[model samples]
Target chain A: FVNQHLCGSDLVEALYLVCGERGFFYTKPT
Target chain B: GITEQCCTSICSLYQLENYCN
Candidate 1:
């Protein structure tokens, strides 16, 4: 789950969370 | 839905940099 209210570095951190740590579709090929 | 969410996040980041930064 991501916080939609994120901004700046917090939003950057969320990208790493969903794409890096979680390995979501954004990081993987469908 | 996941694509939409991911794209939204990326767009938000871009908006922050383009407008706020």
Candidate 2:
């Protein structure tokens, strides 16, 4: 999350699609 | 999440200043 911040797109979607959580975790990548 | 509803919680919890930006 901190590495590549969610840009002009779905904030929640990016949060979950990658990290898949609110607290920000490793679901797929850093 | 909605702006006035969850933005605060999200940004506050995650410390992301650009949460809404």
Candidate 3:
């Protein structure tokens, strides 16, 4: 499927790369 | 190859967001 190719077999792994090692997202104190 | 594609997709989306904003 296109989505599989577009995304990949391990979508979680891809996201892990995005949110891995590098601090892509940060949390703020409320 | 697919992993790189996924990463590129994210990069493109962020670039577009910045371009628009």
Candidate 4:
């Protein structure tokens, strides 16, 4: 999904797709 | 992590300013 999402030229979509329950985890990836 | 940047080496002190997930 990440690779296919990159090919779509959209980061928001990629993030949105993978981040359903653990969206908070993605937010703090620093 | 979106909070204003600060420098700290100590992981313990590198406070998770935005606590609670």
Best-fitting candidate, measured by lDDT?
Answer: 1
lDDT by residue (A1-30, candidate 3, tens digit) is: 223212433444434444565433222222
lDDT of 4 by residue, A1-30 (tens): 212322122322333344444552223335
Report the C-alpha lDDT of model 3 over B1-21, residue by residue, as the tens digit: 434444345433332222221
On DockQ, the leading prediction is 3
Least accurate 10 contiguous residues by lDDT in model 1 chain A: A21-30
Q: What are the clashing pairs of model 2?
A: none
Can you tell me the CAPRI class of model 4? incorrect
Residue A3 shift from truth in candidate 1, angstroms: 4.7
Per-residue CA lDDT of model 2 for A1-30, tens digit only, reads 334333224445554443443454212221
lDDT of 2 by residue, B1-21 (tens): 233433333333254333322
Q: Model 1: how far is A11 from its true place, Å?
A: 0.8
Each candidate: chain B TM-score: 0.23, 0.19, 0.22, 0.15
Ten residues in sequence with the least summed lDDT for candidate 3 chain A? A21-30
Candidate 3 TM-score, C-alpha based: 0.24
How much DockQ does model 4 earn?
0.07
The deviation in Å at residue B11 for candidate 1 is 11
Q: Reference contacts recovered by each candidate, as fractions?
A: 0.02, 0.00, 0.06, 0.09
Most accurate candidate by TM-score: 1
User: In candidate 1, what are the lDDT values of residues A1-30, reduced to their tens digit?
Assistant: 333544444545545444554432233223
Clashes per model (N, Cα, C within 3 A): 0, 0, 0, 0
Instruction: Provide the lDDT at A19 for model 3.
Output: 51
